[PDB]
C-alpha cells in the first residue's frame, strides 16, 4: 500500500502575529530504514508559509544544529537585510528574526538555506520549504483551494543513500561538475505516495527541489496539465500542456482534471541532461499517485487568471553581462568520471574543484559584490553559458523577472510570465529584471546557478542594489 502524501502545515502567524521556524536534525524512514535528515518544524523538509500582499509578517528562526546555517526565501522580494543569503548566518543555536514586508502578487515561493560553500548538502539532508502568498486578485478566481484536498503542493526531490541507510551526499570533483544526484525519488519527502484527491479539479504546486536534476512532469495516462502559474505568480490565462519541464528551485502551479474511480500518475520524463538518465530514470518515473474521491469540491479552470503588464522597451537599460564558466580540468574531469562510472546511458539525449566554477572569470567571492544595480529600474541581464553543456538554471534574488529569451528562443507561453530563473545552457539568456528593494554590501543579493554544486563551488556572484 502507497504511503499517503504528507502535506506541509500551512502556517499562519500566531496570537503574537509571529511565525516561529526551528532548524533541526531528526530521524526519517526511507524504505525502512532509517536516516538522519533535517527539518524545519520536523524533522525533514517544513511548513507552508502563508503569507498576504500587503501584509507583515514577522519570522523567530532558531537554529537547533551545531552548524551555521542561512534561511532565504527564494522567489520574495524583499531586502538584502532578510534575503538570507550566505551573509545571513544564524549561528548554531542561535535564533535571528526577520520581518517580511510582502509586497508582490500571488504566487508559490519556497524557502532553504544558503550557508557559504554548503547549500548543496544542507538542502540534501532535508531543509526545504514551501511560501504561499496570496492576495486580493487570486481569491476572486475559483480555482481549487482546498490545502492539502485539491490544492496540494509537491515538492519533488531526489537523494542517494548509503548501504547503512543514511544519506550519501559529496561534494567532489563529479559533482563539482555535473551536480549531486540520487537513484530513489521523494514527494513531499515519501517515495511514491497517493494522494486521494476530488472528482473535478485538483491544484498541484510543484517544485523541483532536486540539487542538480531537472525534471519534466506529465501524468500517466497523457492527460493534459494546465499551467495557471509561475515562479512569481498567476499566467494571464491557463496554458495547457501535454508535458512540463521544471529546473531546479522553479515552481508551477497546474491543474489537472479528476475522472471518478480510476487512479493516474504524475509522472517524471526522461531528460536530456548529463547524468540524469540513468535508470530507473532512462524511462518515465512515478512521482505520485492520484486517486480520486467523491468529496466535496468547487474548484474551476477559468478562461482568464490575471493581467501581465507589457515588457519594457529596451531602449535605454542597463545592459550587465554575465558570463558563467566551469574550469575546463573540472569540465574534462568530471564528465571523465561520470562516464567511466555510468557509460554511455550519462549521455542518453544529449587544480581545486572548490572554486573551479565561476561568474565572469571569478568564483563567488562574498566578501566583494561583483556590481551595484539600480533600485526601481528595468534592466537586461545577459547571462551565458557558451563554454559547456552543463544545465545552469539561473537565479536572482530580490526580484520576479521577465524571460525576453530562453537559450536560444523567445520563452514558452507558460514561462513568459513572472520568473525568478532562466534557462542557460551551452547558449544565452536574457532577462528584463527590476529590484524594488535596497540591498547592501553586507547582506549582498546572489545571483547564481541553482546546480546546487555549482554555486557551492563558486558559481555565484554578490550585487548591491541602492
Ligand atoms: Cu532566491
Ligand atoms: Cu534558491
Ligand atoms: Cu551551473
Ligand atoms: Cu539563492
Ligand atoms: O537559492
Ligand atoms: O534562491
Known amino acids: 500500500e502507497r504511503p499517503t502524501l504528507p502535506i506541509p502545515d500551512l502556517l499562519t502567524t500566531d496570537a503574537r502575529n509571529r511565525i516561529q521556524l526551528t532548524i533541526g536534525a531528526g530521524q526519517s524512514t526511507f524504505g525502512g530504514k532509517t536516516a538522519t535528515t533535517w527539518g524545519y518544524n520536523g524533522n525533514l523538509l517544513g511548513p507552508a508559509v502563508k503569507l498576504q500582499r500587503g501584509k507583515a509578517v514577522t519570522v523567530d528562526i532558531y537554529n537547533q544544529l551545531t552548524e551555521e546555517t542561512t534561511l532565504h526565501w527564494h522567489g520574495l522580494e524583499v531586502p538584502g537585510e532578510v534575503d538570507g543569503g550566505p551573509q545571513g548566518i544564524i549561528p548554531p543555536g542561535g535564533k535571528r528574526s526577520v520581518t517580511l514586508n510582502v509586497d508582490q502578487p500571488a504566487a508559490t515561493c519556497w524557502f532553504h538555506p544558503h550557508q557559504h560553500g554548503k547549500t548543496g548538502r544542507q538542502v540534501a539532508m532535508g531543509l526545504a520549504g514551501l511560501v504561499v502568498i496570496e492576495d486580493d486578485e487570486i481569491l476572486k478566481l475559483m480555482l481549487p483551494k482546498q490545502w492539502g484536498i485539491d490544492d496540494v503542493p509537491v515538492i519533488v526531490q531526489d537523494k542517494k543513500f548509503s548501504a547503512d541507510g543514511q544519506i550519501d551526499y559529496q561534494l567532489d570533483v563529479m559533482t563539482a561538475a555535473v551536480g549531486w544526484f540520487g537513484d530513489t525519488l521523494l514527494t513531499n519527502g515519501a517515495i511514491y505516495p497517493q494522494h486521494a484527491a476530488p472528482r473535478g479539479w485538483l ?264
Not at 494571464?236 to 528551485?249: R, T
Open 203 to 466: 491544484r498541484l504546486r510543484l517544485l523541483n527541489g532536486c540539487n542538480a536534476r531537472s525534471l519534466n512532469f506529465a501524468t500517466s495516462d497523457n492527460r493534459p496539465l494546465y499551467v495557471i502559474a509561475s515562479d512569481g505568480g498567476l499566467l494571464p490565462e491557463p496554458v495547457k500542456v501535454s508535458e512540463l519541464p521544471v529546473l531546479m528551485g522553479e515552481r508551477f502551479e497546474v491543474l489537472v482534471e479528476v475522472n471518478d474511480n480510476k487512479p493516474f500518475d504524475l509522472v517524471t520524463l526522461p531528460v536530456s541532461q548529463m547524468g540524469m538518465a540513468i535508470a530507473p530514470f532512462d524511462k518515465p518515473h512515478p512521482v505520485m499517485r492520484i486517486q480520486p474521491i467523491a468529496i466535496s469540491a468547487s474548484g474551476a479552470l477559468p478562461d482568464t487568471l490575471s493581467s501581465l503588464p507589457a515588457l519594457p522597451s529596451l531602449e535605454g537599460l542597463t545592459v550587465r553581462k554575465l558570463q558563467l564558466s566551469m574550469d575546463p580540468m573540472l569540465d574534462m574531469m568530471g564528465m571523465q568520471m561520470l562516464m567511466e562510472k555510468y557509460g554511455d546511458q550519462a549521455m542518453a539525449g544529449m587544480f581545486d574543484f572548490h572554486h573551479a566554477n565561476k561568474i565572469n572569470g571569478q568564483a563567488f567571492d562574498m566578501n566583494k559584490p561583483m556590481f551595484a544595480a539600480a533600485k526601481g529600474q528595468y534592466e537586461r541581464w545577459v547571462i551565458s553559458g557558451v563554454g559547456d553543456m552543463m544545465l545552469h538554471p539561473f537565479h536572482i534574488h530580490g526580484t520576479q523577472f521577465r524571460i525576453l529569451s530562453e537559450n536560444g528562443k523567445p520563452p514558452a507561453a507558460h514561462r513568459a510570465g513572472w520568473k525568478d530563473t532562466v534557462k542557460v545552457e551551452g547558449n544565452v539568456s536574457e532577462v528584463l529584471v527590476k529590484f524594488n528593494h535596497d540591498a547592501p554590501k553586507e547582506h549582498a543579493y546572489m545571483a547564481h546557478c541553482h546546480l546546487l554544486e555549482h554555486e557551492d563551488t563558486g558559481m555565484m556572484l554578490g550585487f548591491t542594489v541602492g
